[PDB]
Amino acid sequence: TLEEIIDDNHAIVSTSVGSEHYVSILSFVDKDLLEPGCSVLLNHKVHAVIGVLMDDTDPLVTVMKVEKAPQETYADIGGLDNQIQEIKESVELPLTHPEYYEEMGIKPPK
Amino acid sequence: LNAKVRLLREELQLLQEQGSYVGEVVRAMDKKKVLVKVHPEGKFVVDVDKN
């Protein structure tokens, strides 16, 4: 792991190996894809950067499912109609219409 | 009878060796590399064999 990014062509690295060697980076991988605290590949005796590691873990945050386009629609409930227009105007409507937000100059509610 | 004797003299020669680490493969990657976590040790990317 890259500890921290020292911009004057340096960086802090913690090695669990032993040796470290200050090298010039390859041209496939850049420092713009290096972030502080990132995992990177080092050799075991010339300790140089082949590439950054591309294997990242599970979002560890509190219970979440992400879903693109769920099955259900709002045509099944009925007689509730007014409430349904309220969310409509706020959320759905700016996506549908750029320029209606431009005329007014404001955002629909967050 | 002769074949078996030849098997024995061979065996003495080979035995001076150096072993292999046990690991567990976390996941395979298409660089034809594997990421492995070795048990008292660290994790490495290693290049698959021929077979």
Swiss-Prot record, chain A:
Chief localization: cytoplasm
One Gene Ontology MF term: ATP hydrolysis activity
Protein's UniProt name: 26S proteasome regulatory subunit 4
Disease involvement: Birk-Aharoni syndrome: An autosomal recessive disorder characterized by failure to thrive, severe developmental delay, intellectual disability, spastic tetraplegia with central hypotonia, chorea, hearing loss, micropenis and undescended testes, as well as mild elevation of liver enzymes.
Assembly information from the UniProt record: Component of the 19S proteasome regulatory particle complex. The 26S proteasome consists of a 20S core particle (CP) and two 19S regulatory subunits (RP). The regulatory particle is made of a lid composed of 9 subunits, a base containing 6 ATPases including PSMC1 and few additional components. Interacts with SCA7. Interacts with NGLY1. Interacts with PAAF1.
Keyword Membrane on entry: yes
TM annotation in the entry: none
Source organism (scientific name): Homo sapiens (Human)
Swiss-Prot record, chain B:
Disulfide pattern: none
Location in or out of the cell: Cytoplasm; Nucleus
Family: Belongs to the AAA ATPase family.
Subunit note: Component of the 19S proteasome regulatory particle complex. The 26S proteasome consists of a 20S core particle (CP) and two 19S regulatory subunits (RP). The regulatory particle is made of a lid composed of 9 subunits, a base containing 6 ATPases including PSMC5 and few additional components. Component of a complex with USP49 and RUVBL1. Interacts with PRPF19. Interacts with TRIM5. Interacts with NDC80. Interacts with PAAF1. Interacts, in vitro, with the thyroid hormone receptor (in a thyroid hormone T3-dependent manner) and with retinoid X receptor (RXR). Interacts with ERCC6.
Function, in words: Component of the 26S proteasome, a multiprotein complex involved in the ATP-dependent degradation of ubiquitinated proteins. This complex plays a key role in the maintenance of protein homeostasis by removing misfolded or damaged proteins, which could impair cellular functions, and by removing proteins whose functions are no longer required. Therefore, the proteasome participates in numerous cellular processes, including cell cycle progression, apoptosis, or DNA damage repair.
Name of the protein in question: 26S proteasome regulatory subunit 8
Organism, as annotated: Homo sapiens
